[PDB]
From Swiss-Prot:
The lineage of its organism: Bacteria, Bacillati, Bacillota, Clostridia, Eubacteriales. It comes from Clostridium pasteurianum. Fe cation binds at C6, C9, C39, C42. Residues 1-54 form the Rubredoxin-like domain. InterPro entries: Rubredoxin, Rubredoxin-like_dom, Rubredoxin_dom, Rubredoxin_ET, Rubredoxin_Fe_BS. GO terms for molecular function: electron transfer activity; iron ion binding. Belongs to the rubredoxin family. Signal peptide: none annotated. Its cofactor is Fe(3+). This is Rubredoxin. SUPFAM superfamilies: Rubredoxin-like. Rubredoxin is a small nonheme, iron protein lacking acid-labile sulfide. Its single Fe, chelated to 4 Cys, functions as an electron acceptor and may also stabilize the conformation of the molecule.
Length: 54
């Protein structure tokens, strides 16, 4: 699965790690994250992330 990075702060969403603290289980693909999720570190919306990977 692709990693994604927050373009506001550089946080990396890693799908193996997820963001469980905010309801995104480890193992969740970025496209499957609910679209009201925000970056755990700076609060930016999901739509300010972009792929690292492909
Ligand atoms: Fe961020």
């Amino acid at each position: 699965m692709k990693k994604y990075t927050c373009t506001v702060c550089g946080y990396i969403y890693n799908p193996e790690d997820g963001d469980p603290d905010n309801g995104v289980n480890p193992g969740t693909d970025f496209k499957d994250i609910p679209d009201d999720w925000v970056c755990p570190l700076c609060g930016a919306p999901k739509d300010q992330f972009e792929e690292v990977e492909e």
